[model samples]
Target chain A: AGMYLEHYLDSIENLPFELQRNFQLMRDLDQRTEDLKAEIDKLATEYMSSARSLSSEEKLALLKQIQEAYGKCKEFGDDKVQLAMQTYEMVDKHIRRLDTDL
Target chain B: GMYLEHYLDSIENLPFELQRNFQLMRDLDQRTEDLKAEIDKLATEYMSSARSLSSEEKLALLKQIQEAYGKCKEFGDDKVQLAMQTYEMVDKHIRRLDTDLA
Candidate 1:
């Protein structure tokens, strides 16, 4: 289950830099995708579940329900701006989210 | 230049299966990046001046946001699975060095 050895390479030193970069990215992506995918799953499930429950409500009731939903749902509104920005950050530099994994 | 496609093509020494796997990644990357654009554009509008938006517009926008993230979760999970598969193939190839020594 461990890929520690494959993470390091000495056998392909002769490969072109571009090719080498592909290997590195592939390896980096291999190590990273599970955690990143899981984080996105959690974010999506909580956010979607909240949004779904509020789907038919009007503006006033929407705000009320969101507030009632509190931790899981309301924070999306509170942090929606930051979360949106954070998505790009996750794709690129992978800024530290609350979980610190992605 | 489609840098990823070109990159995969350039690696003459890489196996066809490995090249095909990388190409699959390229395809998924495009899909996810396009999805990201959908969410980001809506997010920018929603976050920048949600106050200005009518309740209907706001709620619609939020639905789109939720939907986009939901879609991302599916693709994101696909990515993790595929990356792990690619890692296994590449690891197998690398392990063949033992055959060379024998």
Candidate 2:
């Protein structure tokens, strides 16, 4: 886990303090993304089990709630992916700048 | 604004006792979505400015992000509470139906 970030950071040990700070933030974002994904998975199981014994009418109500939960989860997932991509690009760009300076 | 009457009309088709719980679930679901949207926008804007934000600007952004995340977490907690309540209600109803059949 985080091998990519570790290797990337190791390759740019001489970057500016601000760049290093951004790298750390990126790592935090990466962790946050993983946590959100795990939570979503766990919640899905809970939702399904809870709804298992419901009648058709009851199930419909539960399903709507579950669907909305999933929708919110997906939004988080999407934002996390976007954040990860942007972080990677920023880090990559910083590395390029350092290489150019070399 | 959601037309509560429209939803109530639809919910009226369900068992009279179950309608209120379903309505509660619907309201919670709507709140969850609203919180999710706010968090998603904060995340997007945070990442967009992450590359070039000044230290003070970054701190403000982080604060806003944390605030939005906190609200989302609160919404999630409420949603979970409501879901558990609905589950218990359904479970009790099912058990009563079973007792009647016996």
**Deviation in angstroms for A46 in model 1?**
44
lDDT of candidate 2 over A1-102, digit per residue (tens):
988765665542322333345445534644653464455445444544542455655654444444444344445444544543444454455445544554
The whole-model lDDT of each prediction reads: 0.43, 0.48
DockQ of predictions, in order shown: 0.01, 0.03
Model 1, CA-based lDDT: 0.43
Which one is best on TM-score? 2
TM-score on alpha carbons, each prediction: 0.42, 0.43
Q: Flag clash pairs in model 2.
A: none
Question: Model 1: per-residue lDDT, tens digit, A1-102?
Answer: 446544333222211222234334433443444344344344334434542333322322322222232222222322332343333332222112212331
Candidate 1 clash pair list: none
Task: State candidate 1's TM-score.
Answer: 0.42
> In candidate 1 chain B, where is summed lDDT lowest over 10 consecutive residues?
B93-102
Query: Share of real interface contacts recovered by each model?
Result: 0.00, 0.00
Error of 1 at A86 (Å): 10
